[PDB]
Coordinates of C-alpha atoms and ligand atoms in Angstrom, one line a residue:
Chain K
X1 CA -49.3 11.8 -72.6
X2 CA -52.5 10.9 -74.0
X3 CA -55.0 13.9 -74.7
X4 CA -58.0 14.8 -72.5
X5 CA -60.2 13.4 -74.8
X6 CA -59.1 9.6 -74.0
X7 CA -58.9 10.4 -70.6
X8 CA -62.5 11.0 -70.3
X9 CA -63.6 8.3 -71.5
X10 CA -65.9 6.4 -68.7
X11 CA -63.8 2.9 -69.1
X12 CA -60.7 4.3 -68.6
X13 CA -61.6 5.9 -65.4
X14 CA -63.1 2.6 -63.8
X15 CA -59.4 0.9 -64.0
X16 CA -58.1 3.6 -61.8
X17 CA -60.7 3.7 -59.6
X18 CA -60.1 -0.5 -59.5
X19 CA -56.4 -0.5 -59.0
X20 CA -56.7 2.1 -56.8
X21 CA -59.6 0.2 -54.1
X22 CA -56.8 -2.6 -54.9
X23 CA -54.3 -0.9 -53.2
X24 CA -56.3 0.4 -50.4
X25 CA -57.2 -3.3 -49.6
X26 CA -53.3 -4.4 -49.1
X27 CA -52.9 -1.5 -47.4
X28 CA -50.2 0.5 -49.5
X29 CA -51.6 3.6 -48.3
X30 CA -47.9 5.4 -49.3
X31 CA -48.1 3.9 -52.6
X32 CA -51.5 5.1 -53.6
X33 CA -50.6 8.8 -52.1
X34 CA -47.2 8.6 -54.5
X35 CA -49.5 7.4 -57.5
X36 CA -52.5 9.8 -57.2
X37 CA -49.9 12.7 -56.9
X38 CA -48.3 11.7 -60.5
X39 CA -52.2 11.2 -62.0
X40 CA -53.0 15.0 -60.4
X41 CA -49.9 15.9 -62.4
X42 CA -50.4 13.6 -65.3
X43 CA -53.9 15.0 -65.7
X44 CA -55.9 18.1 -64.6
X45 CA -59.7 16.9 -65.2
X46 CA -59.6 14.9 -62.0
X47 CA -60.7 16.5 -58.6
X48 CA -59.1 15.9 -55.4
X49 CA -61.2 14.3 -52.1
X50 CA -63.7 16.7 -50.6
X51 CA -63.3 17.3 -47.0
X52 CA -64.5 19.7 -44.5
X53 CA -63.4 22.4 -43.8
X54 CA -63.8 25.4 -40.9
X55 CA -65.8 28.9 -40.6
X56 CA -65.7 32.1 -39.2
X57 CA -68.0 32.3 -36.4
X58 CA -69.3 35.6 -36.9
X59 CA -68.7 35.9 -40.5
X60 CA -69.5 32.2 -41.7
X61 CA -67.5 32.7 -44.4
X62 CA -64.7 29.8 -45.3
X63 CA -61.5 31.2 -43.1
X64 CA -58.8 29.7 -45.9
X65 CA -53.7 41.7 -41.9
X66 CA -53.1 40.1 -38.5
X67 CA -52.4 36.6 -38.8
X68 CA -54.6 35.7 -36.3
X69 CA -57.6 37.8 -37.9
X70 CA -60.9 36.7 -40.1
X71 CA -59.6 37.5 -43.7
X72 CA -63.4 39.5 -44.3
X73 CA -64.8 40.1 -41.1
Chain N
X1 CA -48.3 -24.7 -56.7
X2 CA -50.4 -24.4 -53.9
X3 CA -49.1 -26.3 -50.7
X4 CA -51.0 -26.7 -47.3
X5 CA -50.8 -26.2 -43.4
X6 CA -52.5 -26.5 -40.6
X7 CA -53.8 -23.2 -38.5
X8 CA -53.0 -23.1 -34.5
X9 CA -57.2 -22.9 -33.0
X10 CA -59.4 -24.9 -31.2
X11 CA -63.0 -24.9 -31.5
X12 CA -65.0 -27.2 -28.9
X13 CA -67.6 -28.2 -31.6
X14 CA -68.2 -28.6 -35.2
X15 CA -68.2 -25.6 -37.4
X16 CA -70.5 -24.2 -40.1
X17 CA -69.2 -21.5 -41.6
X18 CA -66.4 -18.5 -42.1
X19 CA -66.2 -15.4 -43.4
X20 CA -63.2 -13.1 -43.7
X21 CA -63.0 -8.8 -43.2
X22 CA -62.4 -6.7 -46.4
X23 CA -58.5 -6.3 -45.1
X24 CA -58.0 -10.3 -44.1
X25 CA -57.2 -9.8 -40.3
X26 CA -60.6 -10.4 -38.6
X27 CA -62.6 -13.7 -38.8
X28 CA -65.9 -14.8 -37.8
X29 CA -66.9 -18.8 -36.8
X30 CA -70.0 -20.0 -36.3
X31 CA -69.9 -23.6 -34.8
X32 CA -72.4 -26.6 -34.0
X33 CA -73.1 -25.0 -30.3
X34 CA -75.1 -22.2 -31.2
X35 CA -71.6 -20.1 -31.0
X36 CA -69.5 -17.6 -32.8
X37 CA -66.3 -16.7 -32.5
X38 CA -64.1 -13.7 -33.5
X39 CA -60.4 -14.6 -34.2
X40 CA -57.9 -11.9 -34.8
X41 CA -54.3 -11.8 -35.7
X42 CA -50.9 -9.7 -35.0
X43 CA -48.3 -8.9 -36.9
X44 CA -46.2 -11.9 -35.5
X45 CA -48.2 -14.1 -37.7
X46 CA -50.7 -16.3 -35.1
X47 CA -54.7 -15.8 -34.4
X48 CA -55.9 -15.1 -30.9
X49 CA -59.4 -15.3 -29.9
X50 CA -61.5 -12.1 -28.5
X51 CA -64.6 -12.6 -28.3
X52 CA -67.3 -15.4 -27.8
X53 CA -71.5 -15.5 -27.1
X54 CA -74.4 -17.5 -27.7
X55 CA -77.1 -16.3 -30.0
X56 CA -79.6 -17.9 -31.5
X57 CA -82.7 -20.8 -30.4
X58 CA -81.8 -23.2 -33.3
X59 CA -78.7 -23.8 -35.4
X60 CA -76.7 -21.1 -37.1
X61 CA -76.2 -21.3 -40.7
X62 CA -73.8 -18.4 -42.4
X63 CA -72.3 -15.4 -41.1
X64 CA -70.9 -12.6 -43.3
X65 CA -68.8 -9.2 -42.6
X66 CA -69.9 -5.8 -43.7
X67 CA -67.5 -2.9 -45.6
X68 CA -65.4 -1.0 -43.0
X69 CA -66.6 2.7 -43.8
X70 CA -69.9 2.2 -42.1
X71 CA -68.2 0.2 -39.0
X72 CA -67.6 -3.4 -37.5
X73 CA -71.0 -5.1 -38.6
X74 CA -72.1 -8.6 -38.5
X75 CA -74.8 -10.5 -39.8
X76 CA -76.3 -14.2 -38.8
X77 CA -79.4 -16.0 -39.7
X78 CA -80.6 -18.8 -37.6
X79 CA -83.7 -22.0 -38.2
X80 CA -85.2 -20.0 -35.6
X81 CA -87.0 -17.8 -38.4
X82 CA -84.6 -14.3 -37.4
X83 CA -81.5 -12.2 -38.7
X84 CA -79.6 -10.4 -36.3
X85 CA -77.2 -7.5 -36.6
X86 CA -74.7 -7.0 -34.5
X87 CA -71.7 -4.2 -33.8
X88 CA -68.6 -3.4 -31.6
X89 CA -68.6 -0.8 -28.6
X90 CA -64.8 -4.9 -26.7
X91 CA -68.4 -6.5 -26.3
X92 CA -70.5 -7.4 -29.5
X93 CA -73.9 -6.1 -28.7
X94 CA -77.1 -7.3 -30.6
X95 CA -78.6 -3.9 -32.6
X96 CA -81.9 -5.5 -35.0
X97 CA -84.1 -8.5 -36.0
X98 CA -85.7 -9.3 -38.9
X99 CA -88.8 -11.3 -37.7
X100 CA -90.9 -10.7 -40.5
X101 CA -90.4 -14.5 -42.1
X102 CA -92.6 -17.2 -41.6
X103 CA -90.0 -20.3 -42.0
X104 CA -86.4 -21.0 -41.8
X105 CA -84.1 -18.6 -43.2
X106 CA -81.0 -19.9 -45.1
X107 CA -79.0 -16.9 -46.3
X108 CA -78.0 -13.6 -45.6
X109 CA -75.5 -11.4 -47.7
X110 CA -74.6 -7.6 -47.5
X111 CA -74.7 -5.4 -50.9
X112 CA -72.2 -3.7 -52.3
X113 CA -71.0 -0.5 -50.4
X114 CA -71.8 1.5 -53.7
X115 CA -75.4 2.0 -53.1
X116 CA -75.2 2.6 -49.1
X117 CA -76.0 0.0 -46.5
X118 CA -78.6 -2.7 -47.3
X119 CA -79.5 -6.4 -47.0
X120 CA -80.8 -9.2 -48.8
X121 CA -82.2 -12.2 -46.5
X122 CA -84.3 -15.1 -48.3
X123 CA -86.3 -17.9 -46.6
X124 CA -87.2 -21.5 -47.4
X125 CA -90.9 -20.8 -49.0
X126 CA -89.4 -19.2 -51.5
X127 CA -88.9 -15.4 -51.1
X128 CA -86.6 -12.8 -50.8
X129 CA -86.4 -9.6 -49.0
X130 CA -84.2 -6.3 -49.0
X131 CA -83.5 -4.4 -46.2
X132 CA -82.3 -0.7 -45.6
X133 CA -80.8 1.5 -43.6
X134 CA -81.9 5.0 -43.6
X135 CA -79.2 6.8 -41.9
X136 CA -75.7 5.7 -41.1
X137 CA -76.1 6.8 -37.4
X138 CA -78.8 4.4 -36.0
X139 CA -78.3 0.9 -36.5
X140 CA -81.1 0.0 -34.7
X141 CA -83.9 1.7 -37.7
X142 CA -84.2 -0.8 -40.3
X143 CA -87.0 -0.7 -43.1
X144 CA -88.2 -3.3 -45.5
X145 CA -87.9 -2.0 -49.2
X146 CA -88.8 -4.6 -51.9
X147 CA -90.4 -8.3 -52.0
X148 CA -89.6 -10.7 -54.6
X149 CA -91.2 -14.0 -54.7
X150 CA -89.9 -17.0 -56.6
X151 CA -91.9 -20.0 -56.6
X152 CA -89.7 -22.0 -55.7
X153 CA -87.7 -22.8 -52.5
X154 CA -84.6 -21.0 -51.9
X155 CA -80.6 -21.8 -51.3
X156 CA -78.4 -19.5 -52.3
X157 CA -78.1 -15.5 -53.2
X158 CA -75.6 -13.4 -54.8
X159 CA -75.0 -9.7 -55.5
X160 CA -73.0 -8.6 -58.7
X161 CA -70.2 -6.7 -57.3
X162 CA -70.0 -3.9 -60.4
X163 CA -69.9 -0.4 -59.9
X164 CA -70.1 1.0 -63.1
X165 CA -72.6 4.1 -63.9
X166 CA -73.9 1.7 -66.6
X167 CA -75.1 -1.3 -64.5
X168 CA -78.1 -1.6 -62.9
X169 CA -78.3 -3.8 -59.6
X170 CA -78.9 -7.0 -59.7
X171 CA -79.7 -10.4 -57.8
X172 CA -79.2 -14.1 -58.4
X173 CA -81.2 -17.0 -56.7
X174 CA -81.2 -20.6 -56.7
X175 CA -82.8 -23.5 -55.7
X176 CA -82.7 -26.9 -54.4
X177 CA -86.3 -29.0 -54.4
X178 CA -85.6 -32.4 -55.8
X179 CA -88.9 -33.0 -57.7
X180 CA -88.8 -35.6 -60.1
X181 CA -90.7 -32.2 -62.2
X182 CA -88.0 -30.7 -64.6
X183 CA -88.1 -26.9 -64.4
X184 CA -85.4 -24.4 -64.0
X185 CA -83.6 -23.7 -61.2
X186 CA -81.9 -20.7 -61.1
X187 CA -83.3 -17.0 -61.6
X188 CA -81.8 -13.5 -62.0
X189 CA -83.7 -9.9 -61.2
X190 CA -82.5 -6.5 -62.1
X191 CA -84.0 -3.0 -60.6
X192 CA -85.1 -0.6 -63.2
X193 CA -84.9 2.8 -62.1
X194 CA -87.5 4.2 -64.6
X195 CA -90.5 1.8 -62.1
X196 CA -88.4 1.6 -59.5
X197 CA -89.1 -2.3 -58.8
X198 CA -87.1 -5.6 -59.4
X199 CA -88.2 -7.8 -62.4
X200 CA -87.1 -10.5 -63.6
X201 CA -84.7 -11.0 -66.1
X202 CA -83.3 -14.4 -67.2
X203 CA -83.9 -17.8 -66.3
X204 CA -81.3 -21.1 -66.9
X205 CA -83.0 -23.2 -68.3
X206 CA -80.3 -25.7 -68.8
X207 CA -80.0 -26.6 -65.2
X208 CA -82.7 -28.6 -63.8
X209 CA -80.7 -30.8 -61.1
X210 CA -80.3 -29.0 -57.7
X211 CA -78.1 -26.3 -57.0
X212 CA -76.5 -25.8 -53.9
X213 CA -74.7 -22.7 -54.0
X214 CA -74.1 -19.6 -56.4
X215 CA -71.2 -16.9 -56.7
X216 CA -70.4 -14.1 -59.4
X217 CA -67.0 -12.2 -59.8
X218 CA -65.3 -9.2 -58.9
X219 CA -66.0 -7.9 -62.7
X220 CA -62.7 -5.2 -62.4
X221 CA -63.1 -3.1 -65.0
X222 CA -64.5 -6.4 -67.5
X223 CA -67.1 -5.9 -70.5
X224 CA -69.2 -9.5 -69.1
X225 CA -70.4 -11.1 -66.1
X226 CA -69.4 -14.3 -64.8
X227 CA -71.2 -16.9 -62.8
X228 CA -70.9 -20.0 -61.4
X229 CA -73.1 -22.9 -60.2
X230 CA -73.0 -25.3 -57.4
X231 CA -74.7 -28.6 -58.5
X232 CA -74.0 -32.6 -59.3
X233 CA -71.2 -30.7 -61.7
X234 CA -69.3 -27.2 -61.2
X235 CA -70.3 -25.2 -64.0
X236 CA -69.3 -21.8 -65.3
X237 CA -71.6 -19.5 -67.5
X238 CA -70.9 -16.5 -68.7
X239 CA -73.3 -13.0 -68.5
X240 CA -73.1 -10.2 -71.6
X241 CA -74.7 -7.7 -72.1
X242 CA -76.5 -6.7 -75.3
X243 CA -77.1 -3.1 -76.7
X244 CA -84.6 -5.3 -68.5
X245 CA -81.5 -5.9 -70.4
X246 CA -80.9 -8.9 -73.0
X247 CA -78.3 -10.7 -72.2
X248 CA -76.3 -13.4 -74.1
X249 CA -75.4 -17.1 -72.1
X250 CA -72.4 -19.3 -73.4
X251 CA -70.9 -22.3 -71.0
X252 CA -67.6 -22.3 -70.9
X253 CA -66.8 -25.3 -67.9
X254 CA -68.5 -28.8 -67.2
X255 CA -66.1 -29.9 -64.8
X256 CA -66.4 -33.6 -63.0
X257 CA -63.3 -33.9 -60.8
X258 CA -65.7 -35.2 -57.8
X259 CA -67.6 -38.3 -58.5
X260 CA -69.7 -36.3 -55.8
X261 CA -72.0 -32.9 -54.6
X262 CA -70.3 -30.1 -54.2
X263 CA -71.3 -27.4 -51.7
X264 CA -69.2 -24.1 -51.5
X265 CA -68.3 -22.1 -54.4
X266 CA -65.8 -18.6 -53.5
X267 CA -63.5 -16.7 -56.1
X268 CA -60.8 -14.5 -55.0
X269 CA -60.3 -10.6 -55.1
X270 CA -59.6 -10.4 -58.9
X271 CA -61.6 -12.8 -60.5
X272 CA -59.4 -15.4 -62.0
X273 CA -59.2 -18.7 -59.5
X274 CA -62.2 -20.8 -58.5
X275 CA -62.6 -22.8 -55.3
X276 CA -64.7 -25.7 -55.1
X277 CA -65.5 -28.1 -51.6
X278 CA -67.1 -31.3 -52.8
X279 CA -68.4 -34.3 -50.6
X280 CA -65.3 -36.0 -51.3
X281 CA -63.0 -34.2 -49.0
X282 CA -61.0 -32.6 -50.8
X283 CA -61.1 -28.8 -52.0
X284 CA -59.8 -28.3 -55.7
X285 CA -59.1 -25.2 -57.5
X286 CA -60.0 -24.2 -61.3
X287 CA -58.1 -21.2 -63.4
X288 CA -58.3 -20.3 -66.8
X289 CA -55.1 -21.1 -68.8
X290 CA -53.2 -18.9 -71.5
X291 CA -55.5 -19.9 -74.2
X292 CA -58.9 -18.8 -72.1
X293 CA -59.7 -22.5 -71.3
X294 CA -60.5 -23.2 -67.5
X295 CA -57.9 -26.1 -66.3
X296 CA -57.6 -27.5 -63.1
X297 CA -54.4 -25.7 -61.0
X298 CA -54.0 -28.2 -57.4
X299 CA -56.1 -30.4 -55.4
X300 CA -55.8 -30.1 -51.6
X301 CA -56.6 -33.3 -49.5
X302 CA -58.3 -32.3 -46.5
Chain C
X1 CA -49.9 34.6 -10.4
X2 CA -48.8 30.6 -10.1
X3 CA -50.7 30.3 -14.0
X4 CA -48.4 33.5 -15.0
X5 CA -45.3 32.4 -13.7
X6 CA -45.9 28.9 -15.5
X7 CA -46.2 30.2 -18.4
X8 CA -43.1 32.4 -18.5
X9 CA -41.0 29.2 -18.5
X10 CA -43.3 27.5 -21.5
X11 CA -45.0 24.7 -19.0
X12 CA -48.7 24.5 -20.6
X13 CA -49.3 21.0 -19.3
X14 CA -48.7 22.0 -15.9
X15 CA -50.8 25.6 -16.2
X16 CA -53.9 23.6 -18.1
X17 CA -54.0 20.8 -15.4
X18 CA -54.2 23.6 -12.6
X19 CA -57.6 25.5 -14.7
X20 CA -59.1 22.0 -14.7
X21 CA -58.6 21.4 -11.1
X22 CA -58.9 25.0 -9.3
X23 CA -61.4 25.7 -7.0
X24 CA -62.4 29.2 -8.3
X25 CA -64.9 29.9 -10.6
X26 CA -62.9 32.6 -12.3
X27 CA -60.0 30.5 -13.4
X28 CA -61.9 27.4 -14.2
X29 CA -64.2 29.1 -16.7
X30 CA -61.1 30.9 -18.1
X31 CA -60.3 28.0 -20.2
X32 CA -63.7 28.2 -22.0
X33 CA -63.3 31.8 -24.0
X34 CA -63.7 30.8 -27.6
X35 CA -62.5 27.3 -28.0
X36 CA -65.1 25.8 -30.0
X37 CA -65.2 25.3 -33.9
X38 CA -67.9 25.5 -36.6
X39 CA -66.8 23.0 -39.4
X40 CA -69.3 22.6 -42.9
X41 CA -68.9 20.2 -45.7
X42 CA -67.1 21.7 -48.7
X43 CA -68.9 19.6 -50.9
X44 CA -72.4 21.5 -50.2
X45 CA -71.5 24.3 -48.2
X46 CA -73.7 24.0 -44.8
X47 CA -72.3 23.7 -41.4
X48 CA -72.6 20.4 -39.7
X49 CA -74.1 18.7 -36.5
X50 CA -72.4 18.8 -33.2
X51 CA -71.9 15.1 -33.0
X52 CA -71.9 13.3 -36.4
X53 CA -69.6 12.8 -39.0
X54 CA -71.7 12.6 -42.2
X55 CA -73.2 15.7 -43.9
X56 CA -76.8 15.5 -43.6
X57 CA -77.7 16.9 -47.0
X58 CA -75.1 14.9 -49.3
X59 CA -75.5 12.0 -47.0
X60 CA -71.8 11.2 -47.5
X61 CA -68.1 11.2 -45.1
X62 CA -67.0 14.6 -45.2
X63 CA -64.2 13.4 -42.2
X64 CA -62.1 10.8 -44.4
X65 CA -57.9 10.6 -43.6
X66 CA -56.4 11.4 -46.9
X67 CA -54.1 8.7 -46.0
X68 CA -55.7 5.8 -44.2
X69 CA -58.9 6.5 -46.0
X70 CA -60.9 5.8 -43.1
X71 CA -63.8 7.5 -40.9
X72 CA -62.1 9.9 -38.5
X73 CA -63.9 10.2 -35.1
X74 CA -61.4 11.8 -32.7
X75 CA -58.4 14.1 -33.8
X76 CA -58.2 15.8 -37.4
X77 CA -55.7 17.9 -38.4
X78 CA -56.5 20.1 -41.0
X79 CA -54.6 22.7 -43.3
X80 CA -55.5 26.3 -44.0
X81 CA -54.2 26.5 -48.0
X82 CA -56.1 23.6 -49.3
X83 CA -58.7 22.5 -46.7
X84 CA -57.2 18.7 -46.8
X85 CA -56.3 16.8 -43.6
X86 CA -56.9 14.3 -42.0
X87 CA -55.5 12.0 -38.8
X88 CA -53.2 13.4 -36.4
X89 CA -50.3 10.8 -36.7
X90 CA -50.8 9.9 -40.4
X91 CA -50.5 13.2 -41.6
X92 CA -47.6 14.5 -39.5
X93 CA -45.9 11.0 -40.4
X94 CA -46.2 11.8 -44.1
X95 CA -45.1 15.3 -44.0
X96 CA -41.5 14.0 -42.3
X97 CA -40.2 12.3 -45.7
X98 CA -42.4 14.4 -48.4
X99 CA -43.3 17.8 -48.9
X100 CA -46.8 16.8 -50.8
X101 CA -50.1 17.1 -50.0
X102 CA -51.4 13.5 -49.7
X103 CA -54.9 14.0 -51.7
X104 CA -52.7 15.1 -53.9
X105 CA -53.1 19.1 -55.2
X106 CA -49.5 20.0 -55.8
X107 CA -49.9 22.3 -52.5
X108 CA -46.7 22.6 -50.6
X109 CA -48.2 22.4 -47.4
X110 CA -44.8 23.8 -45.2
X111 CA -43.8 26.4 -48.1
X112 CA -40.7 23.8 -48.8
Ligands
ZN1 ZN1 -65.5 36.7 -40.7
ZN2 ZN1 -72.4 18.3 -47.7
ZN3 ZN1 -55.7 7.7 -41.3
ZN4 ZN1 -54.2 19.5 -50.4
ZN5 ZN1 -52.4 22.4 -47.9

């Protein structure tokens, strides 16, 4: 419940980060997915992981009407 | 609380040294015979062997793992003046050498996966070097970065494992010349990112006996450092900061539960027990009680 | 007419194997019309290499399993609402007994 200005602070968000590479080391990889969907809820500040992600090849621009169709080009 | 067992291996000769993987499944041996083994495990509970080779022209002193998100590296320094890197393609095959040392080399030790993929490597005449790794793709490109000489000769290394935006990196060294001379013995750098070189930044004054070994803690999330020393008498210090960096140095454990030298030093993944190897054969383990006062918690008999 | 017939009856296994294998130029190069992807890195925008997984510019894993938080090198499935994906196996595991994005996004990746 607590606002978003605790949240930001830049101690509160090593603990996370900790418990978190914690998890990962036992290998609770279900866990960690169950708790970093309540935090995304809990919170809206944080940012999800950055992937990659797939292009038109003609366009270039960021596929993501005929379903099978460019959404631009 | 802590009870003991014995593991199913064999090993033909004497061993020297072992190192664990960031999960605990893999191992890594190196033995008397110029040898090092790989020893992995199932789910059954029992270690098989997979691998085995020869490496070195002169006896092989520590080997260490490397963090999985760059791949399955190894690391082994020799008397024979070199530090080799090695890698998996079922066949460990040999990838770099550090030549560039001019005695026998007595400790290698990977930094923290925070700040990419380096090494830190120091020799007998007393000075240390860090390596690099441009790019993540070639294993075989390495580049010497920084040089840092001590004085003194050299025994043990450690990295502080912090990765806060509000600590720089730094280094601990120590040494082990038994001059009848009283100086200090151990030394800590930090990198300051305004000059962009390592100075130094504290020095111990209160130990002037040799040190044999030297390990810091997981800090998780901790407002202070903490250190301890390998010497005639385990000793734990402990590193704040004030607001290079001033720092403030209490003592908070004179332990004498050996009558004798010890010679390894290793915490755990949180921080909060101590294991100590002696010259009495037996391996004892320290942890602070409920009042913040480190008491001893089991002694295993070798 | 043997590749047409195959795939009346839904045998793609069968009808693949025979473009690898067939002795005609014709039918072996039919299996090469447009079956190549461009994939960038979402942090910086700019396509990648043809054989790498780190981004060149951000010098960081763009191809981590939102799962098993590893380096994936082989298979990567991937989702066209919120770009997030990761290994084959993992994913489709996950997805059997929750209807959550694992990064975590509040995407319902199947539409429930
Ligand atoms: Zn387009
Ligand atoms: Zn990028
Ligand atoms: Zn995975
Ligand atoms: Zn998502
Ligand atoms: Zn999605």
């Amino acid at each position: 419940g607590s606002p978003l200005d605790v949240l930001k602070d830049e101690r509160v968000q090593y603990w996370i980060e900790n418990y978190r590479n914690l998890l990962d080391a036992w290998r609770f990889w279900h866990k960690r997915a169950e708790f970093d969907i309540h935090r995304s809820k809990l919170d809206p500040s944080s940012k999800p992981l950055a992937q990659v992600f797939v292009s038109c090849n003609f366009c270039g621009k960021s596929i993501s009407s005929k379903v099978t169709s460019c959404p631009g080009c | 609380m802590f009870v003991a067992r014995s593991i199913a291996a064999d090993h033909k000769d004497l061993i020297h040294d072992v190192s664990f993987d960031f999960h605990g499944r893999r191992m890594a041996t190196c033995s008397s015979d110029q040898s090092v083994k790989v020893w992995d495990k199932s789910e059954s509970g029992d270690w098989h062997c997979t691998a085995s080779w020869k490496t070195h022209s002169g006896s092989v002193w520590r080997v260490t793992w490397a963090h999985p998100e760059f791949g399955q590296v190894l690391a082994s320094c020799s008397f024979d003046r070199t530090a080799a890197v090695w890698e998996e393609i079922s066949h460990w095959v040999k990838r770099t050498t550090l030549v560039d040392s001019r005695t026998s080399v007595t400790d290698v030790k990977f930094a923290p996966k925070h700040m990419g993929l380096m090494l830190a490597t120091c020799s007998a005449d007393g000075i240390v070097r860090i390596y690099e790794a441009p790019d993540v793709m070639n294993l075989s490109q390495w580049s010497l970065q920084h040089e840092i000489s001590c004085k003194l000769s050299c025994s043990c290394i450690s990295w502080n494992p912090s990765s806060s935006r509000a600590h720089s990196p730094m280094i601990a060294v120590g040494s082990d010349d038994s001059s009848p001379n009283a100086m200090a013995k151990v030394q800590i750098f930090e990198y300051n990112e305004n000059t962009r070189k390592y100075a130094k930044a504290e020095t111990l004054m209160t130990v002037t006996d040799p040190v044999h070994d030297i390990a810091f803690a997981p800090n998780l999330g901790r407002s202070f450092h903490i250190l301890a020393i390998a010497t005639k008498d385990v000793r734990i210090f402990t590193l704040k900061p004030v607001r290079p960096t001033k720092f403030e140095i209490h003592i908070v454990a004179q332990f004498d539960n050996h009558n004798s030298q010890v010679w390894r030093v290793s915490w755990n993944i949180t921080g909060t027990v101590l294991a100590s190897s002696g010259d009495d054969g037996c391996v004892r383990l320290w942890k602070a009680n409920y009042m913040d006062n480190w008491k001893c918690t089991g002694i295993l008999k070798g | 007419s043997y590749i047409d017939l195959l795939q009346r009856f839904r045998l793609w296994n069968v009808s693949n194997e025979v473009v690898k294998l067939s002795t005609s130029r014709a039918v072996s190069c039919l299996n090469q019309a447009s079956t190549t992807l461009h994939v960038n890195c979402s942090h910086c925008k700019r396509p990648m290499s043809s054989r790498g997984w780190v981004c060149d510019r951000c010098h960081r894993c763009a191809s981590m399993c939102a799962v098993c938080h590893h380096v994936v090198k082989g298979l990567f499935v991937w989702c066209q609402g919120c770009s997030h994906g990761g290994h084959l196996q993992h994913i489709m595991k996950w997805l059997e007994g929750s209807s959550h994005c694992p990064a975590g996004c509040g995407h319902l990746c199947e539409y429930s």
